[PDB]
Amino acid sequence: IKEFTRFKTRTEEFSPYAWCKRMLENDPVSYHEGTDTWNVFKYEDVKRVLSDYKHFSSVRKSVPDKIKITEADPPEHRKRRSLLAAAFTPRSLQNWEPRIQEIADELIEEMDEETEIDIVQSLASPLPIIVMSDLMGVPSKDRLLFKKWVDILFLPFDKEKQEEVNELKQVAAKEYYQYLYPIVVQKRLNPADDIISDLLKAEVDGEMFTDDEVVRTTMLILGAGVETTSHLLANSFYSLLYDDKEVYQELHENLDLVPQAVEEMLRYRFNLIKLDRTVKEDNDLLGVELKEGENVVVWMSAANLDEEMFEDAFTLNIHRPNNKKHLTFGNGPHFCLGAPLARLEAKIALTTFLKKFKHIEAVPSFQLEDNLTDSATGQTLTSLPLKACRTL
């Protein structure tokens, strides 16, 4: 990432609109000598690379093998995805809503009007983690223990840390495994409505998981869904405090708008997300002769800001007809399997908050350049304080 983007400040990277703008207009398909990648930005072209597995492929450049789902095209992808999709059935999802609600209620009841609330510390970070501990079937008594390891492994470093992180991660990995494996063993014998039990009962094309593979699969799932869901929640409150005064009140008066607002956040405020493909059959299609083996990186963050697809692309507009056509969850066969959940967590989180709080206020003293740390998405809020106002 760093070797191509090169932002002078953390604030530039948290809000990279100008950079996306100028790439979309002045360099929509740029080669980069220093990393040996092509770089695609336009919406129609990004969508073509993500979906056309035949010309652009997910095979490229420990994790079970039968579940390296990202790293396979049709037709062997179908096997890997069906295997994992056993834990993400519409039945489970239906059951998850009330359990996601209770957790949201607990966290929001714990916030008080009188003080400044830190949204990252008190909602954006713990909700995805507490949620995933629940849907996994970790006992509530061990929830805080789970959170300790999930933090370290999966939440964007701490603020000040270095390469002794790699050692801290290695330990958390070892302790997580020690902790979870016996729960997997016990759910093999005595199953319940949770991801672990469903992964154990999964059979697809004569493949079943070992207990060890189930454990490593939960790490995959946490690794896919915690940083990302945390980031969406954080940036959703960021946007409500700084991008448009009125949007909060608007949602407060019409709670049926929350899902649209989530979609507009995925479009406009899920910044720097990108994906990788390798070329497997030569083509123009983009308007440059690409050869097999070259690395195409796509920048969905930018695609989501292409004026061709989105009217007033650089403006937070929750009423824009086609917000939901954003590429933040991908497109084509690899479309985020966790989208239903992620959309669900965000709707519940926001809705529950809006029901308790009529107004929110940004703290004048808040310096955005402090309070940002490096991550897989670019930068990410380590803190976000607000003042809020009870009832209606």
Name the residues that contact ligand HEM, by CB under 6 A.
69-70, 81, 84, 221, 224-225, 228-229, 232, 270, 275, 328-330, 334, 336-338, 341-342
Residues 6+ apart with CB under 8 A from 302: 20, 23, 24, 41, 46
Which one, 69 or 386, has the nearer CB to ligand HEM? 69
Which one, 309 or 341, has the nearer CB to ligand HEM? 341
Which one, 60 or 174, has the nearer CB to ligand HEM? 60
Q: Which of 304, 298, 301 is nearest to 275 (CA)?
A: 298
- Whether residue 84 contacts residue 216, with contact meaning beta carbons closer than 8 Å, is answered with no
DSSP 3-state of 27: coil
Minimum separation from the CB atom of position 341 to ligand HEM (A): 5
DSSP string, 321-375: TTGGG-STT-SSTT--TTHHHHHHHHHHHHHHHHHHEEEEEE-TT--SSTTEEEE
Minimum separation from the CB atom of position 32 to ligand HEM (A): 20
CA distances from residue 41 to 32, 139, 160 in whole angstroms, order as listed = 14, 44, 32
Which one, 183 or 275, has the nearer CB to ligand HEM? 275
Minimum separation from the CB atom of position 230 to ligand HEM (A): 9
Residues 6+ apart with CB under 8 A from 153: 169, 172, 173, 176, 219, 222, 223
Minimum separation from the CB atom of position 62 to ligand HEM (A): 17
Minimum separation from the CB atom of position 347 to ligand HEM (A): 12
Which one, 200 or 342, has the nearer CB to ligand HEM? 342
Label residue 89 exposed, middle or buried (CB < 10 Å: 0-12, 13-18, 19+): exposed
Tokens standing for residue 294: 């070259």
Minimum separation from the CB atom of position 78 to ligand HEM (A): 9
CA–CA gap between residue 383 and residue 366 (Å, rounded): 9
Which one, 302 or 388, has the nearer CB to ligand HEM? 302
Minimum separation from the CB atom of position 361 to ligand HEM (A): 26
- Whether residue 381 contacts residue 234, with contact meaning beta carbons closer than 8 Å, is answered with yes
Which one, 172 or 336, has the nearer CB to ligand HEM? 336
Residue nearest to ligand HEM (CB): 338
